[PDB]
Each structure stands twice: as structure tokens, then as C-alpha cells.
Design a protein around this ligand. Structure first.
Ligand SMILES: CC(=O)N[C@@H]1[C@@H](O)[C@H](O)[C@@H](CO)O[C@H]1O
Ligand SMILES: CC(=O)N[C@@H]1[C@@H](O)[C@H](O)[C@@H](CO)O[C@H]1O
Ligand SMILES: CC(=O)N[C@@H]1[C@@H](O)[C@H](O)[C@@H](CO)O[C@H]1O
Ligand SMILES: [Cu+2]
Ligand SMILES: [Cu+2]
Ligand SMILES: [Cu+2]
Ligand SMILES: [Cu+2]
Ligand SMILES: [Cu+2]
Ligand SMILES: [Cu+2]
Ligand SMILES: [Cu+2]
Lengths: 408, 408, 408, 408
């Protein structure tokens, strides 16, 4: 990078860059050290250790369902970087930008073997699996849905684009968050699938190697939002919202030794001061941009989205239990529904209670125009949460959604 | 007039006017028909009449914590106003402005003896109380806060003013309601105080005649907003918010006979169609202002409110149980606090569940500062919610209040 | 043992008569013996002593949800009757008919105390409640809908009438026990309202005496149907239906000593062997007429109904595990629903799962008509399930009601 | 588009005719388009594309176990027929009638190869199997019971005859689809015997063409019933039954583009709108007679049956998740059982759970008679369930069969 470690597409890496990361985590993996892989995992969920790392009832950590979410996870990736160079990660933990239709799957983390046979090495792509220690099983993803190589009625017109872009449109940090965070979940799910020990499970994603690679990109999106904020005229590290959490540290990052042998994360635990990453954490992205759209190109695209009447459904997420996913559709008066959109929440047991202080908006303008329906009409919205396993979830007490309207 | 009634303050009510009114409800109070007083009372709460009078588990029947709240309560006064009409009234249901500091509690409804001219009579003040029949009980009032009688750092800048005015600084209807309603909640308590049977108890609170009086000033100022919105450029009769509910016919009004003999309110159960009062209900307010400044002077006021940094506490109101009061204090790092502010909610144990889909912000600016406190100063915030009875209710699971900051 | 008995209405009871029964159960209720009250109480459901009385997992021995229900409960009133006799009774167990709107609560079972009145002295009305020793608890009551009195959109046609009359229409023993049972569910509800230890709970209900009182009026209908059929041309005592189970001994009446010291009760445990009560069980009814109408008049009243197009909703009952109650409305394409009817089951932790082999029908012609609708027009139809202890039951997994059309 | 079609028997087919269809499907089977074979194949069950085609948990879109089954499969033969036409076909999809003992296997679908024979040349018989691309597998067959040929304790009365004849007796649309479906189950079994990828599996079966062939002979009976009824006095196109679902659009035929490029198919997705095939779907049958017997002769043959006491067993089907087959005998009190009958369902991992709202009946008079037994005598009745892949299915939890008696 500048010195700043540069985080890049796990895709356009160097045979060398790659190699380094391979040996790196390979080592990292059997680093029984407090700041060794396997204990880092114990941060995000199981074994939990948050109220304290051993007090009464152990809630797991990882600010999920709250504002101070990205800050937490931001420390975590770095907590993994300032962890790879411990093993000579010649570079910064690369990102797997799911935001774009990926036909073939990135080989960096799909291969189960790796012939360093040119050099002296020939085995498993450590960046393709790990072993859950205490819970003695194997993270084994079930991508199941490789329709993460899907839609785009216009090509780039895909889920994540719609998701992030909107997220990005938000100017109030907190508005941006709920949305930003829901896209996070997508990939948690799109990979863990219907399996237990995997990326689709609060308690276990940490264990899988791709975790880093994804949050690396989510935190790359986060960055992308700061940068756009700056371009809009706002201080990108200014959070005037939720100023009750930002000051409160961030466990265990704040725990110090001997659970976190890092000092920067430690010193930088109060989210408040974790926004401007480049300073406190020297690392950066090669291209703060979304799907080859310049920061000015993004802004600009957004304001063109604003050029017309739009229609959204609001979601009051209170989420609890295991992570689940939900579909919703626009039923017409005699009952003519159309799949309108979907989203998923990550979660488990030890999750720490959470309820968004606000709605999760989700555009439906299109599905509506298609079906010849306007905001002046009678149409009802219908949902069905569903567990990470064929278990229909009662959509009863679950507050019905609003149906916002954003003119101009 | 032909196709309108006019609403004045109880305090500008010429004996002429109030005479009509005294004999009106008096007659009303004796109307045993489905659109006579007693009847026209449960429409609110007890006895339950809402899923359907015939249903098994029955809830209240009035929209609370919900964007359609004002329209319902607005539709309700029309219901009363129309009965008085049917009973020799010649004026609209007067509003008891509680905005301005009350020197004493108005005559119209305070004394309990209507003597006066023409008939040379001498009998009870119908507008001073009725009595709950089904319950064999009788209405009550307990103004344990009459110190509601003028507080105000700089004079006319009083609580409910502070309150109702913020609310007006808001063009996102839902945003304004979640504030416009908490305001309204105050009198509900300022009057019933602690009487299990009174303006302070979701259930019987519709039987005391102030209900109407009060709910007329609210309806008043709500009309105000509309007006104000006009002066801001927006369509004062369009709500591009919560449309999923702005369309569900408001019961009982949507019941028609034999529960609701009034036609122009079935014809209007849809909130959607309750915004245009003068026109669908033909009833006007004498004036449209709030404590002095006109619609304009209003707009030309709030702005000033926006010329300085402000600091709010947001409250995530899931509300449920019985009516109850919450007060909150800012606590300095050390251990001492200062009374922050306080709001209250009205709520029977016969209410349909309800949780707001947005935070309920309230200003702690000054207080904070008058405590040598900066928006960026390490400080906590403890809350207290006690019933109307006096059981301290454990907030152990009440979501901690945020601490929003505000630019400009 | 020797002598017939004539069961009378719980109103045309002569103080001599009443006296014999008052003193009888009084004695019964102190009969510690296996054929004593607290014990005969057990036969229905709790303490369960079912497949056997000693095996690991046990259930409430009573038949519910199955074809063979009316026999089980028939043997049971006999079991109790013979027992009342054994203690001095000399009249059959009276029946509290409720197809007729009760304007008050029959003395027999309501007085808190009774007066020998044939020697004058005070004792508590044994037919007014009882203890429940194993549970160390006491029955209780709650006449919930004493609004049962409240009935008759056109006179005597009360819910139960419509309800039983229909059951009497069906000429197939099976198609009819569907209705006849679901009818025998109402009093259960209307006497135990929300109280856990009462009639509304499979477990304790047979602990309260009004059960005997009820199930005597049901068996009164069962005999009556037996007339309507004989009058119709059929041999009462045989059924062209369900023969798979009409011969499986009923428990525990079959056990014999030591859980059933009664021999007629046992020897006649096979339901087929109990259709001709008087012959097997010496006992008859003062009268067999619903609303005082002849078996002939019934056969007339029915066909007369067989004269218009009707319309019914279809219910596939299965039974939760707790007594519940659902009422279904019948919303228009508009979104304006309209209460149309209801029924309730009698569930219980300790039951043996059951589902009726056919649908339970329930006419909606009328409600339809009074809404400008008919079988060809478009209408939807909604349900809402509630537990006895106010607790909405998820109806998500509840096969939707079908809507029939019956010509003639 | 324009022109009627007459569906013929798969035997009285003229080489010209056959030719048009042979070349047609041949073409069809190479139609990669949404309305191509491999795709139209999907409509039934696998690949599932059901509630919607993109939501998380998906099911086989086909209706089974429900009232609305005969329409679904009716729209489906049309969906395929129009498609055969689109490729050159000019005759309706023939029907392989099997109510009549097939002594051989009809050429149409059996020759491994065919000879243009109207220009002479070899091509493979497209109506003889197909590939199944998604599964990367190929249909297969196993005529298991080519012992189907084997039938007739007294001639033409083959299992299917007894079976269908009965379905035609019932005059209630619903009571009859119970039989009519369970009948449409036999060929499924008798063609796919033990082979996983064949007709005996909900998933793949519509992949083999003889399905079309079958479901054309079923729809042939469905029309026939429609005669017997019209002849009986009823309006074919309406049903006095199940109206709750006769108007719920069938999937995916309703979807439209891009999963159903057919418009008649969609526009007529509501089952009510499909009873009068010829009118909606241009197409008829050469004949409508079971065993060559007139609609009149049927109405005669039936009543004639309505002339003796019969006896039936009762089955409450629910459906496992896999196609199964059970056969019930009817053991004496002796311990000497006697095969009495059987039937089989068509299950599948991917189904939408269903249970019939009523029992499925199946007569045992005869077997009873030939054993010196009748409805009053004592006899028990046993079942044995086996999977297609030899695997005894636990019948422990399977509501026992009831045994009816039908006089007249
Ligand atoms: C995976 C691979 O490249 N194949 C090699 C194989 O050619 C070789 O015979 C062997 C020596 O034991 O190691 C294998 O498994
Ligand atoms: C059996 C074993 O150790 N696995 C080897 C692996 O090391 C090597 O990378 C691969 C290609 O040479 O050949 C496999 O057979
Ligand atoms: C003369 C009279 O009765 N009318 C009074 C008036 O003097 C007073 O100014 C007004 C409030 O400003 O209230 C009216 O009722
Ligand atoms: Cu996380
Ligand atoms: Cu209210
Ligand atoms: Cu109110
Ligand atoms: Cu019972
Ligand atoms: Cu005496
Ligand atoms: Cu099928
Ligand atoms: Cu030739």
C-alpha cells in the first residue's frame, strides 16, 4: 500500500500475494496463541466470553443488531490482519466482493488442495476450511445457492447492488447502518446454507476462513460510505447518532491480555474512534468504489435514483433465535402476489438481544410498476420467515410491515 | 355553513355558546340510543368492542402507538360533535388549550352546578363528569399535578409547548406523530391522576367529558400541522407514510348500524379520508395558531430552533401493560444526576399491543449544558417508569435510550 | 341393580327429588372407595389411567375427537348415576338442557347452600363444586358467556339450536357425531371460562358436578337422535359406520376391579353394546325433544330446512393439547370482514391425539345473505384461535376451512 | 391458437397420426426454450419452482392430495399438448387407457425405434424415454406388475374398473376426487416399479412421456365423470364443493413469462375456469366411455350396483414424502388373514404436505363374502406399507382403517 497495507480483491492477487496468504493462515491456523487463529474465533461467538470472558451467563459478542456493529467487525478484520503479517501476510486481508454476479467461484478459497510444487509445498488450501476446536466438528459450507451469480434485470441490477447502493444513499449514519448490516447477512447465508457449523451461524462463521474475506469487503463497503460522505460534505468520521454506544468500548478487543495480544485494537475499542481507519489502523483499499463506479460516479448515480417516485416496505426487525431468512411478496386484492424481495438475519443462541431503533426500508417500486400497481392502490404485503433449516417460522406477533412512499 | 360548525376555546365561550353546550350533552347524557353518550363512549376502550362486538377475546378499539392514531381520535370527536348537534348544539366541541400555562381549571367544566339564565334552573354540570354505567362505577379526576399551572424558564416556553412545538418541526407525518401523541398523552394523566376510573386509564378515560375537550385541542393542533405543512409547501392532506394502515377502515366507525348510527363517520372510517376535516366533517376551528404566533410566525419560529446545536434522548417505546409514567435523568460520570425530562403513556390491559417503529426523541440540550456538559461528555442516562398506581416497573428489559446529536 | 330411572330436567325437579340427589352426591363426594367421587372423577382424564394404569406414558382415558365418543361419555354418566343410586339416590341424573336460552342459573347447581327442606337444615350444595384432592386444588367456574342467555336472531334458534338441529339432520351416525361432539363442547367452555381448574379443561372438568349435569343433557340429545332415526326408518342400536371401533372395549370401564367396581359398566364396555340404554342401563328420559319439539316435528322441521340453498364452512379439526376456542369471520374481497360463527374444542396436555376423519361443517348462509353475497360471488374466510387462558394460537399450520354448497 | 383437437386412444392411432406426434415431440424434446420439454417437465415437481421460483424453501408445484388436483393435471396435459402442436403436432395428446387389461405394451410408446414410414427412415421413438438434464440422469421404467394385464375375477372388472367405476358413482365432486386421484396413482406405480428416476417418483415422472400418455387417459375419465353428472342432472363446469380453492391460481401455469410462455395456460389458471375444456382448451375425446360403455350405460351400471349391501374399508391418507404402496388384507378372529385390496400413493421429498379432508373408501364386500363373513360378524383388518425401493414403512402411526357399511 502506502507502506498502509493494501486490501485487494482476493481475485486480482499475485501468485505470490496468494502464496503468502496461504502459508500465512496455514501457520495462523495452528497458532495456539491467545491471538492465534482459533482463539480469535472465540471472539465473534462460541465459545462466548463477553459480559467478561468468564462471569455468570456468557453472552457471545459481536455487536449484531446494533449501530456499533461495523466498528466491532472492523476491529475484527484487522484483528485478523495484524494477525496474518504475524505470519508474513505480504499483504492485507483481501476482499471477496460478492457485489457482483460471480459465475465461477473465487479459487482463492474454493480449492481444497494447493500444489506449491514448483516450490516445496503441496497440500490443503487452509483458506478453504478450518476445524472447530471445542465444538469438535468441521466448518463445512453448503454454498447450496450459487445463485450469487444471479439477477440483474439490467446486468449490474442485482441484489447486493440494490441493497448496498440504497445503503449508501443514506446520509444519517444510523440510517445507513441497519441497511448496511442486512446486506452483511446475505453472504453469511449464501455460503453456510442449510448446514449447522458454518458461515450461516452466529455461533460458527468465525471458524470458516471466508469470514475474513467477506467482512473484508463489507468493511470495504463501510469505507466506501465514509469516502462518499466526505465527497458529500460530511465529516466521514463524524457520528452524531447513537453516541451512547460509540463511547462504550468494544469487547474483547478491550479485554487486553492475555485474550487480545493486540494493542491497536485494544487502544481502539470505543467505536467512536475507529471510523477513520487509515489513521488508527494503517491499511486501506486499492479502490474505494462499488462495481467499477467512481465515488463520484456512485453519488451521481444515486441522485438519479432520487429523480422519481419510489415505494418501500418497512421492516421492524427485532430478530431473535437462530438466524433465519425471510421472503415477502406483494399480494393483490383478489390475491395476486409477486415475489417482491427478501433478506436474512444472522443469529443464534448466545446472541445478545437486539431490536433496531428504526425501520429497514426495501424498495418495491419495480415489482409494483410491473404488476401495473401504484402507491394509490390496494395491495397487501405478505411474509414468511424460515429458519436456516426447512422449519416454517410463525410470522404472527411479528409486526406487519409499513409501505412507505418516497415521491419526487 | 350548509355543508359548517366551528370550534372555539372553552375560554371564549360566550354564555350564549356554552349554554347550548350545557343542555346538549345533558340531553346527550340521557340518550340511551346506540349514539348516545354511554354508548358513544366504549367506542374508545371498555367495554371492548373491537375485533368485533361479537368476538371472543376482545381488545380496546382505539388506534394507539400507531400512525393512524390521530385520524381515529379525530374521527371520534366528530362522532361526539355530531351527537351534540343532534341534540341542539350550535357549536363545535370546544378545545381546552393546555399548551399555555393554566391559571386555574376552566369553569365550563370545573364547577358542578349549572344554574343560569332563562330556565332559572340549578342542576349538575353535565360537562363536569358523567358516570360509567356498565361498571356501576362513576367517573373521577385527580389533578395531583396542577402545578401544570405555569412553569417556564423564559415564560411561554412550557413543557407541552416544548413538546407540541418540536412535533410541529417535522414534516414526516410519522415523525410528527410519534411526538404529537406522546404530547396528547399528558393531560390523559394530568387529569385522572391516579383514579382507576378516569382520564388516566385507557379503559374508562373516555367517559369523562374533558376527553372530548382535550381531544379537540389535539385535533386542533393536528389540523394546525396540516395547515403548517401547507405553508411549508406540502399537500396537507396527503400522508406518504404508513400506507398499509392509512387504509384499514377504523372500527367501530366502520361498523355502521347498529353500532354506529352516524353516517358520515362510516363513510369515513378510512384514516386516509379523515385528513380533510372541513369538507368531510364540516367543522372549523375559530382560529389556527398555537400560543400566539400564526401559521407563519410558527414556521418563522422553529427555524430559529434550528440555528443551534441541540441534543436529544431517543426512547424506543414498545409500550405495554397499564398506563404508566417514565421520568429520566442524566447521570455524570461520578454518581449524581439531574432530572432530564419526562413523558407518559396511557394504556389499559385491554389494549391491542403496540410498539413504535421509530424513536421518540426529546430534547436534553440545555439541561445537559447547564451541567457544564458538552455533547461529547462521558455521561449516562437512567430512566424510571412507574404505574399510575405505584409499582416501580423493572426496566431491566427496556431498551436503553439513545443520545442523538443534532447539527446546525 | 333393580329399578328404571327417569332422568328429569334440572328444573322440573321436585324438592323431594332434588333432596334425594342432594343428599346422595353429598355422600358420594365422601366415598373414598374406588367407585367414589374423587375416583370416578379420574375416569375422564386426570389422574390418567389409560392404556393401562401403570405403564410409562399414560393418557386421559376419555374418547374425544373420535367416533366412539358419545358412548364413552354415555357409559360415564351411567357410571356416575349408578353411583349416585349406590348412595341413596332414586332418580336419574338430571340434565341441564341449554339448547334453550337460560335466563338464570339453575338453582340445583347454583345455590351456594341448600336447605334439607323436608326436615330443614343447612348443608353445602354438593352439586355446587368439589375439591380435587390429588391436585390439592378445587374446581372453579366462570360463566364467561353467561351471554349464552343472549341468543336468538329470531327467537329460540340459539347457537346450540342451529348447532344441534344440524347434527340431527345428518342421517349418518358418523357425519353427525362430528357435530354432536363439537356441540358438547360449548357448556365446557361456558362454565369454565378462564379458570384452569374447571370444566373447560379436559383434566379437571369431570371434577365439577355440573359435568354430569351437562353430559346428561348431551346424552339426552344422543337418545333423541336415536329417535329421529328410528322415526326415520333405522335401527337405533346398530350403526353403518365406524364399525372398526364400535367393539373395542371402552377404558377403564372395562378394566373391572380394582379400578371399576361397577359391573354393568364393565360388562357393557363395548360401544355397540350401549346404544339401547334402557335395557342395558335401566334409565330413561322424561322427554326426548329439542326445544320441546317432537321427534316427528323434528323430522318436519328438518326437511323444511332441506328447502333452500345453504352454504357451510369446512373444518378439519385435530386438536392441540389444550382447550382452545376459534371464531371465524368471512371477509369480503373488500377487506371488510364479518363475524360468521365459532366453536370450541376441549383439549388437554394429557389427551390421545386425534383428528376427525371428516370435516366439521357449520352453516354461513345467513351471514352471507345479510351482506349481499352468495356461493358464486368472491369471498374469503378467516379464523382466530385463542386458548382458554388468553393466548392467541398460531393458526398458520391449520388447514384452511373449505367452503361448501349444499343445494336441495 | 385456432384448431379443436381430438385426443385418440393410443391404439386406434393412424400412422399418419402417430407420425405427426412422433416427429412433434421429437422436436419438442429438443426445445431448449422455456416451453420446451425438459422445462415443461419442471412444471410438475423437480426442479421445484413453486411458491415462487426463487424463494428459499421450494416445493413440487404440482397439486396432489388436494381437491384441486384434476385441474392442475388438466392444465398440464394442455400445457404439453399446445406444446406438441407448437412443434407440428396436429392431433391431441392420445390417452393410454388402462382400465382395460393391456395384454401387451402399446407400440406408440414402446418401440425402442420408429420408422417414418411415410418417407421411411430411422429415428428413436421420442415417446419412449427422455433424458433429465438437470439431474444429469435418464428416465427408466419397470413394468413391475405388467401383471396389470392380469386381472378380472369375472372379466373386465379390473382393479382399475372397480376402482374408477366407484369414483364415478359418487355424485359429490369432492368425495370423488378422492377416488379418482388415488386411481391416477396406479400407472405411476406400474410403470416405474422400483426405478428411482421414473414414473413412480413425484420428482422425475413427468420426465418420461408416458406420463402425458397417462394423465391423458385420466383427464379422459374426468371428462367422462363430467358426463355422467350432466347426464345425472348437474352443471359440469361448477362444483358445490371445495370452493375455497377452485379459484386460487394454479402455479406455475399462472406465473406467465418467463416461466410460462403459454397464455392460455396462464389466463386459465383458476381451476373453476377449466372445467369446460373444449371452449377453453380446444380439444376433445374420440369417445367418453369406460370399457366402451355409454354415459347412459354407466348411469345404469351404477345404480345396479346400488342394489346390494356392500362394505368398505376407510383410509385417511396423509402422505409420507416418498411414493409408497400399501395393501390391506382382512384377517379373521381366527388369525387367518386374507388379502382384500391395495392402492398406492405418489410421494416425494419435495411435496407440499397434504391430507384428504375425507376418507378414501375401497369396497371389501366380495372378499368378505368369499370367507363366510359380513359387516356384523367379527373381523379385523391389517395393512402393510412399502416404499418403491423395497423398504417396509412403519405403519405404527397411521390412523387405522375404519370399516363402513353402505346399505341400499
Ligand atoms: C492427485 C494426483 O496428482 N495424483 C497422484 C498420482 O498420480 C500418483 O500416482 C500418487 C503416488 O502415490 O500420488 C497421486 O494421488
Ligand atoms: C495423497 C496426498 O498427500 N495428496 C496429494 C497432494 O499433496 C498433492 O498436492 C497432489 C498433487 O500433487 O497429489 C495428491 O495425491
Ligand atoms: C362579552 C362576552 O360574553 N364575550 C366574551 C368576551 O368579552 C371575551 O373577550 C372573549 C375572550 O377573549 O370571550 C367571550 O365569551
Ligand atoms: Cu458478525
Ligand atoms: Cu385514546
Ligand atoms: Cu386519547
Ligand atoms: Cu369428555
Ligand atoms: Cu317442616
Ligand atoms: Cu402428478
Ligand atoms: Cu414409400
Amino acid at each position: 500500500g502506502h507502506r498502509n497495507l493494501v486490501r485487494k480483491s482476493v481475485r486480482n492477487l499475485s501468485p505470490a500475494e496468494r502464496a503468502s496468504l496461504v502459508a500465512a493462515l496455514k501457520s495462523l491456523q495452528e497458532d495456539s496463541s491467545a491471538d492465534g487463529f482459533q482463539s480469535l474465533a472465540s471472539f465473534h461467538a462460541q465459545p462466548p466470553l463477553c459480559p467478561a470472558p468468564a462471569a455468570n451467563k456468557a453472552f457471545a459478542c459481536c455487536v449484531h443488531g446494533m449501530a456499533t456493529f461495523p466498528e466491532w467487525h472492523r476491529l475484527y478484520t484487522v484483528q485478523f490482519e495484524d494477525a496474518l503479517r504475524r505470519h508474513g501476510s505480504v499483504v492485507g486481508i483481501p476482499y471477496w466482493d460478492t457485489v457482483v454476479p460471480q459465475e465461477d467461484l473465487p479459487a482463492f478459497f474454493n480449492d481444497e488442495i494447493w500444489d506449491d510444487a514448483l516450490f516445496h509445498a503441496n497440500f490443503t488450501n487452509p483458506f478453504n476450511g478450518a476445524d472447530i476446536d471445542f465444538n469438535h466438528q468441521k466448518i463445512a459450507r453448503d454454498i447450496n445457492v450459487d445463485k450469487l451469480a444471479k439477477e440483474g434485470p439490467k446486468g449490474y441490477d442485482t441484489w447486493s447492488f440494490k441493497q448496498y447502493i440504497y445503503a449508501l444513499e443514506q446520509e444519517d449514519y444510523c440510517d445507513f447502518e441497519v441497511q448496511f448490516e442486512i446486506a452483511h447477512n446475505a453472504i453469511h447465508a449464501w455460503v453456510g446454507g442449510t448446514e449447522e457449523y458454518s458461515m450461516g451461524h452466529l455461533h460458527y462463521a468465525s471458524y470458516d476462513p471466508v469470514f475474513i474475506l467477506h467482512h473484508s469487503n463489507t468493511d470495504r463497503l463501510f469505507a466506501l460510505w465514509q469516502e462518499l460522505q466526505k465527497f458529500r460534505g460530511h465529516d466521514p468520521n463524524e457520528v452524531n447518532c447513537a453516541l451512547e454506544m460509540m463511547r462504550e468500548p468494544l469487547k474483547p478487543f478491550s479485554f487486553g491480555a492475555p485474550y487480545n495480544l493486540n494493542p491497536t485494537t485494544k487502544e481502539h475499542s470505543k467505536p467512536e474512534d475507529t471510523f477513520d481507519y487509515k489513521g488508527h489502523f494503517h491499511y486501506e483499499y486499492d479502490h474505494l468504489e462499488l462495481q467499477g463506479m467512481n465515488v463520484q460516479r456512485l453519488h451521481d448515480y444515486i441522485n438519479q435514483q432520487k429523480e422519481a417516485d419510489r415505494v418501500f416496505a418497512g421492516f421492524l426487525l427485532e430478530g431473535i433465535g437462530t438466524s433465519a431468512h425471510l421472503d415477502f411478496s406483494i399480494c393483490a386484492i383478489d390475491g395476486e402476489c409477486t415475489h417482491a424481495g427478501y433478506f436474512d438475519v444472522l443469529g443464534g443462541s448466545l446472541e445478545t438481544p437486539w431490536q433496531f431503533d428504526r425501520l429497514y426500508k426495501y424498495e418495491i417500486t419495480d415489482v409494483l410498476e410491473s404488476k401495473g400497481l401504484d402507491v394509490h392502490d390496494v395491495f397487501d404485503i405478505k411474509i414468511t420467515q424460515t429458519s436456516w433449516d426447512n422449519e416454517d417460522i410463525s410470522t404472527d406477533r411479528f409486526p406487519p410491515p409499513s409501505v412507505i412512499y418516497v415521491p419526487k
